[PDB]
Ligand binder design. Structure first.
Ligand SMILES: O=C1N[C@H](O)CCN1[C@@H]1O[C@H](CO)[C@@H](O)[C@H]1O
Ligand SMILES: O=C1N[C@H](O)CCN1[C@@H]1O[C@H](CO)[C@@H](O)[C@H]1O
Ligand SMILES: O=C1N[C@H](O)CCN1[C@@H]1O[C@H](CO)[C@@H](O)[C@H]1O
Ligand SMILES: O=C1N[C@H](O)CCN1[C@@H]1O[C@H](CO)[C@@H](O)[C@H]1O
Ligand SMILES: [Zn+2]
Ligand SMILES: [Zn+2]
Ligand SMILES: [Zn+2]
Ligand SMILES: [Zn+2]
Lengths: 134, 134, 136, 136
């Protein structure tokens, strides 16, 4: 829905302002839209020990889940990288996939252009909960 | 930390634990942190079918706080369903805590409300940190 | 099958025996084939704190890199799932991609059947070194 | 220094040469001594996505486990930092603890000086395997 898309894209851009990224100096914002229209946002949060950082998409998803929301319709991602749409890393894709494959990922540039792909399209033939079921 | 803030933290952590996404371990964890200005942020563990892609309660709480512009932390309380052990932060959580200072308090609780309190410094002595990269 | 595929399949199946997986009871093996024909094995190694585990594919890659090998041709993955091909998680795909998009992932079943996809296919529109302007 | 200490320190220093760290430009080496005398080396291996990196200590431990070794006597860590002994991060401490608390961590400087602490001392009142035991 055009109302929700625009709010989501702006929320992702705004979330970027809170990024804690003194090591990469590469800020990332994300915003997730739930089934009932609520938006949760997040940013990357780095650690002196690089592996202990977290991505924007996961900050947003983790916030939503902690507040009792597991039904996601879309997630938008923003960065300062001008030359390419910001794409989720594989770890973020796997966390997205834990909560379904059919939902939309908006990969943006600072100028407001974007491309959309589903979680399924971004993580084909995925490992998932089904592997551990039965 | 005032007994009133401690009680608020204990209740917040236990309440947050109810939202835990942990179908793999069936080991729910909640956490609540207190900022300098008295705001409380809570979190829970959020697991993934690929075990390494989960996140701990403490980090969900810290990441939520940072995403909303708070990096000044006074205390964090942790809750679990383990009756016989105080719930202790894993080393990754200790390292994320340490990114935001060593002097603050960690309340490791039991379900009955008894707890052990230690500083981040005490839990992670001679720590790796931002100074290693200066 | 070609000799190198036979090698990948056997080494990956063997690697699974070393899995440290008391929590999931889901053992995974991986075998990584380098450009010069050397195979590096790996397995999942879990931790009481679930997020601190590592996957088989990353164990294998990390072993190869630590020994000075960065030219990877193929990696095979093995599990105990008889009725599913074992697929790499997104984190493993991202680590694979750090070392290139143009190499093969063999997703196997215990009966020795498999599906092959490239890293590029498994991680379309990949985040990577270009995002940090490291390709210069 | 005892012969096994000399070996640990030299192997850890040598392991640093293999570091894949184009993002931090902060190379780390580790050397893990098993009960039977075998040394496993490791180095940090970074990723364009910073969280997908791995530390030297875990590279070494994961290699050892993958080859069937779980009895660890000591681990030494090396870096290019002259001003500070290189200390393991909390994640590495937690992985060390999965395999016991009574063993030794040598935190070194490039000049060969070091401080030694046990895993227990570096990770007091630790979360561990017992937290997840079925019967309590
Ligand atoms: O937030 C992100 N989302 C994408 O999925 C990948 C990249 N990032 C973050 O960008 C910085 C550089 O890797 C890191 O801080 C990293 O976590
Ligand atoms: O939230 C946690 N806090 C402590 O730091 C460690 C343990 N956990 C969580 O407990 C489950 C079992 O490892 C996992 O889901 C794990 O993330
Ligand atoms: O080794 C793996 N490779 C694939 O990328 C994903 C699955 N795994 C491992 O399987 C167990 C369950 O998630 C875990 O121990 C997990 O790390
Ligand atoms: O290997 C390490 N051992 C210590 O436990 C912590 C630091 N590191 C590594 O140093 C770089 C900067 O955080 C990173 O590549 C990081 O993984
Ligand atoms: Zn990511
Ligand atoms: Zn933890
Ligand atoms: Zn994996
Ligand atoms: Zn480490």
């Amino acid at each position: 829905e055009p109302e929700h898309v625009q709010r989501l894209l702006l929320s992702s851009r705004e979330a970027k302002k809170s990024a804690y990224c003194p090591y990469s100096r590469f800020p990332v914002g994300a915003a997730l839209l739930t089934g009932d229209g609520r938006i949760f946002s997040g940013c990357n949060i780095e650690n002196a020990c690089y592996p202990l950082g977290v991505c924007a998409e996961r900050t947003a998803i983790q916030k939503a889940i902690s507040e009792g929301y597991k039904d996601f319709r879309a997630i938008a991602i923003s960065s300062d990288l001008q030359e390419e749409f910001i794409s989720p890393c594989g770890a973020c894709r796997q966390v997205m996939r834990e909560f379904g494959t059919d939902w939309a990922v908006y990969m943006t540039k600072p100028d407001g252009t974007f491309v959309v792909r589903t979680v399924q399209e971004l993580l084909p033939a995925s490992f998932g909960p089904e592997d551990l079921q039965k």
